[PDB]
Ligand SMILES: *[C@@H]1O[C@H](CO)[C@@H](O[C@@H]2O[C@H](CO)[C@@H](O[C@@H]3O[C@H](CO)[C@@H](O)[C@H](O)[C@@H]3O)[C@H](O)[C@H]2NC(C)=O)[C@H](O)[C@H]1NC(C)=O
Ligand SMILES: *[C@@H]1O[C@H](CO)[C@@H](O[C@@H]2O[C@H](CO)[C@@H](O)[C@H](O)[C@H]2NC(C)=O)[C@H](O)[C@H]1NC(C)=O
C-alpha cells in the first residue's frame with residue numbers, strides 16, 4: 001500500500017509518503033523511468049529517505 | 050514507572066513474573082513460557 005501524511009491543508013503543504021512493508025530500494029526502483037501507479041515522482045529523489 | 054533494584058517484599062518474591070534483563074525482550078519468566086507455548090502464525094515480519 002501507499003499512504004500520505006499531511007499536517008492539514010491550511011497548516012502547510014509539505015507532505016510525506018509511506019510505502020507499506022516495502023523498504024527503500026525498490027522505491028528507488030520505482031523512479032519515473034518506469035511508470036508505476038503513482039504518477040507524481042518529484043519526491044523519489046529523497047535526500048531524507 | 051521503574052521497579053527498585055532491591056526486592057525487599059516481606060519474603061513475597063516475584064522474579065518469575067518480573068521482567069528479565071537477560072532476555073532480549075525484558076519479559077517475565079511466565080510470559081516467555083506463554084510465547085514459547087503458542088504455535089503462533091502470521092508472525093508479521095518484514096520478510097523480503
Ligand atoms: C524467590 O524464592 C527463591 C527461593 O525460595 C529465592 O532464591 C532462589 O533460591 C533457589 C534455590 O537456591 C535458586 O534456584 C537454584 O538454586 C540452585 C542451588 O544450587 C542454583 O545452583 C541455581 O543456579 C538456582 O539459583 C534461585 O536461583 C534463587 N533465586 C530465584 C529468583 O529463585 C528468591 O530470592 C526469591 N526471590 C525472587 C525475586 O525470586
Ligand atoms: C527494610 O528495607 C531495608 C532494605 O531492604 C532492609 O533494612 C534492613 O534492616 C535491618 C535491621 O532490622 C538491618 O540490619 C539491615 O542492614 C537493613 N538492610 C539494608 C540493605 O539496609 C530490610 O529489608 C527492611 N527492614 C528494615 C528494618 O530495614
Ligand SMILES: *[C@@H]1O[C@H](CO)[C@@H](O)[C@H](O)[C@H]1NC(C)=O
Nearest residue numbers: 006007008009010011012013
Ligand atoms: C486553518 O486554520 C485557520 C485558523 O487557524 C482556520 O480558520 C481554518 O478553518 C483552518 N482550515 C481548515 C479547518 O480547513
